[PDB]
Write a protein that holds these residues in place. Structure first.
Motif, PDB file in Angstrom:
ATOM      1  N   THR A   1       0.845  -1.196   0.000  1.00 27.55           N
ATOM      2  CA  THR A   1       0.000   0.000   0.000  1.00 27.55           C
ATOM      3  C   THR A   1       0.887   1.255   0.000  1.00 27.55           C
ATOM      4  N   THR A   2       1.903   1.278   0.870  1.00 27.93           N
ATOM      5  CA  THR A   2       2.789   2.450   1.019  1.00 27.93           C
ATOM      6  C   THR A   2       4.291   2.153   1.192  1.00 27.93           C
TER       7      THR A   2
ATOM      8  N   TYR B   1       3.346  -7.863   7.392  1.00 29.27           N
ATOM      9  CA  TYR B   1       2.527  -7.657   6.203  1.00 29.27           C
ATOM     10  C   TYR B   1       1.877  -6.270   6.024  1.00 29.27           C
ATOM     11  N   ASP B   2       2.335  -5.601   4.967  1.00 32.40           N
ATOM     12  CA  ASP B   2       1.867  -4.295   4.480  1.00 32.40           C
ATOM     13  C   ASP B   2       2.259  -3.108   5.358  1.00 32.40           C
ATOM     14  N   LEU B   3       3.064  -3.378   6.384  1.00 32.67           N
ATOM     15  CA  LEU B   3       3.464  -2.399   7.371  1.00 32.67           C
ATOM     16  C   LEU B   3       4.972  -2.136   7.411  1.00 32.67           C
ATOM     17  N   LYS B   4       5.767  -3.198   7.512  1.00 36.56           N
ATOM     18  CA  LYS B   4       7.208  -3.047   7.687  1.00 36.56           C
ATOM     19  C   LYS B   4       8.001  -4.156   7.017  1.00 36.56           C
ATOM     20  N   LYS B   5       8.942  -3.777   6.157  1.00 37.45           N
ATOM     21  CA  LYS B   5       9.788  -4.712   5.406  1.00 37.45           C
ATOM     22  C   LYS B   5      10.847  -5.428   6.266  1.00 37.45           C
TER      23      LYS B   5
ATOM     24  N   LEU C   1       2.397   3.285  10.580  1.00 37.61           N
ATOM     25  CA  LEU C   1       2.513   2.146   9.655  1.00 37.61           C
ATOM     26  C   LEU C   1       1.099   1.615   9.363  1.00 37.61           C
ATOM     27  N   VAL C   2       0.254   1.487  10.388  1.00 37.04           N
ATOM     28  CA  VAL C   2      -1.129   1.026  10.200  1.00 37.04           C
ATOM     29  C   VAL C   2      -1.930   1.927   9.261  1.00 37.04           C
ATOM     30  N   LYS C   3      -1.807   3.252   9.420  1.00 37.63           N
ATOM     31  CA  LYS C   3      -2.472   4.239   8.518  1.00 37.63           C
ATOM     32  C   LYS C   3      -1.946   4.202   7.091  1.00 37.63           C
ATOM     33  N   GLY C   4      -0.719   3.735   6.890  1.00 43.20           N
ATOM     34  CA  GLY C   4      -0.162   3.585   5.547  1.00 43.20           C
ATOM     35  C   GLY C   4      -0.393   2.200   4.953  1.00 43.20           C
ATOM     36  N   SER C   5      -1.169   1.355   5.635  1.00 41.07           N
ATOM     37  CA  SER C   5      -1.470  -0.001   5.170  1.00 41.07           C
ATOM     38  C   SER C   5      -2.956  -0.185   4.882  1.00 41.07           C
ATOM     39  N   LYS C   6      -3.302  -1.372   4.409  1.00 39.07           N
ATOM     40  CA  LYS C   6      -4.689  -1.741   4.146  1.00 39.07           C
ATOM     41  C   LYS C   6      -5.536  -1.870   5.420  1.00 39.07           C
ATOM     42  N   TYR C   7      -4.870  -1.952   6.572  1.00 40.35           N
ATOM     43  CA  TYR C   7      -5.514  -2.119   7.870  1.00 40.35           C
ATOM     44  C   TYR C   7      -6.034  -0.825   8.467  1.00 40.35           C
ATOM     45  N   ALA C   8      -5.824   0.273   7.735  1.00 42.23           N
ATOM     46  CA  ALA C   8      -6.360   1.580   8.059  1.00 42.23           C
ATOM     47  C   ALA C   8      -7.869   1.638   7.806  1.00 42.23           C
TER      48      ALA C   8
ATOM     49  N   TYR D   1     -11.124  -3.096   9.867  1.00 40.84           N
ATOM     50  CA  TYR D   1     -10.071  -3.718  10.665  1.00 40.84           C
ATOM     51  C   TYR D   1      -9.899  -3.100  12.041  1.00 40.84           C
ATOM     52  N   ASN D   2     -10.595  -2.000  12.281  1.00 41.20           N
ATOM     53  CA  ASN D   2     -10.451  -1.237  13.509  1.00 41.20           C
ATOM     54  C   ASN D   2     -11.738  -1.097  14.306  1.00 41.20           C
ATOM     55  N   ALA D   3     -12.755  -1.884  13.960  1.00 41.89           N
ATOM     56  CA  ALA D   3     -14.000  -1.884  14.712  1.00 41.89           C
ATOM     57  C   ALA D   3     -13.785  -2.911  15.821  1.00 41.89           C
TER      58      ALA D   3
END
Length: 231
Positions: free
Chosen positions: A123-124, A135-139, A186-193, A197-199
Motif C-alpha cells: 500500500t505504502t 505484512y503491508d506495514l514493515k519490510k 505504519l497502520v495508517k499507511g497499510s490496508k488495515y487503516a 479492521y479497527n472496529a
C-alpha cells in the motif's frame, strides 16, 4: 537432531508448550469455527499441511487458529513452501469482528518472493509484503531463506515490553514496538487503516489473541509448532 514434533527436555524446562503433536489437530480449530475444518488440511508424516486449492470447497479449509490466546510469548514454527506459495503466521488474532472475509491480525508473511505477484506489492512501504515482513506495514531485512521445498523456522516474539521481533532461520529479520506512535503510522499507511479492521479496537493492539496459520490456497507444510509464554 531431536525427534520432530517434541520438546527437547530443555525446551520443556524453559517453559515451551508443544502446539502440534505430529499426529492430530488437537489444540487447533478453524478461524471463526467451533472445530478443525473438515476439508483442506492434512496431517501426514509429522507435517500439518494446507491443501492446494483446485478451486472447489473440498480443497479449501480456511485459516486455523490455536484454541488458546497469547499476550507475551515466543512462538516458533517450521514451514516448507511450494513454488509461488503464500501463507502466514498471524498473531493477536481476535475473532471479534464479522465472520466475513478472514480472521485478521498482525502477520509474519510467508511467501515465495521470486514467484508470487504479491511480493512486489504494497500500500505504502516498499517490500512490506515479502517473506518475514510485517505484512503491508514493515519490510524484513537479513532474510536467509532455505528455498522452495526446504524447511525453515519462523519465530514471533512479543515481549511484556510490547517490543516485537520476527526471526527466520535463527536471524532476526524485523523489529517493532506494538501500539507505538510509529506503529500506528505504519497502520495508517497499510490496508488495515480501513475501518473494517479497527472496529472493536485499534488494529493489532488487542491485549491478547490467537495465533493463526493461513490457508491462502497454496500448499505449505508446518511442524515443530511450539510456544513459550513470557512473564
Amino acid at each position: 537432531t531431536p525427534a520432530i514434533n517434541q520438546l527437547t527436555d530443555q525446551e520443556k524446562a524453559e517453559g515451551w508448550a508443544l502446539l502440534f503433536d505430529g499426529k492430530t489437530t488437537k489444540g487447533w480449530r478453524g478461524a471463526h469455527k467451533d472445530a478443525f475444518p473438515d476439508h483442506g488440511w492434512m496431517v501426514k508424516d509429522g507435517e500439518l499441511i494446507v491443501q492446494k486449492s483446485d478451486g472447489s470447497e473440498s480443497t479449501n479449509g480456511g485459516d486455523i487458529v490455536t484454541e488458546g490466546e497469547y499476550s507475551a510469548f515466543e512462538f516458533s514454527v517450521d514451514f516448507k513452501i511450494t513454488e509461488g506459495a503464500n501463507s502466514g503466521i498471524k498473531y493477536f488474532v481476535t475473532e471479534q469482528e464479522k465472520q466475513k472475509g478472514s480472521a485478521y491480525g498482525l502477520e509474519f508473511q510467508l511467501l515465495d518472493d521470486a514467484k508470487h505477484p504479491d511480493a512486489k506489492l504494497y500500500t505504502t512501504f516498499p517490500g512490506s509484503r515479502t517473506l518475514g515482513s510485517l505484512y503491508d506495514l514493515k519490510k524484513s531485512e537479513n532474510i536467509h531463506f532455505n528455498g522452495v521445498g526446504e524447511w525453515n523456522t519462523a519465530v514471533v516474539k512479543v515481549f511484556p515490553n510490547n517490543h516485537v521481533e520476527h526471526w527466520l532461520n535463527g536471524v532476526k529479520v524485523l523489529e517493532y514496538e506494538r501500539g507505538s506512535k510509529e506503529f500506528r503510522d505504519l497502520v495508517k499507511g497499510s490496508k488495515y487503516a480501513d475501518p473494517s479492521y479497527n472496529a472493536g479496537g485499534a488494529f493489532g493492539e488487542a491485549p491478547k489473541g490467537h495465533i493463526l496459520l493461513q490457508d491462502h490456497g497454496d500448499e505449505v507444510a508446518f511442524r515443530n509448532i511450539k510456544v513459550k509464554e513470557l512473564k
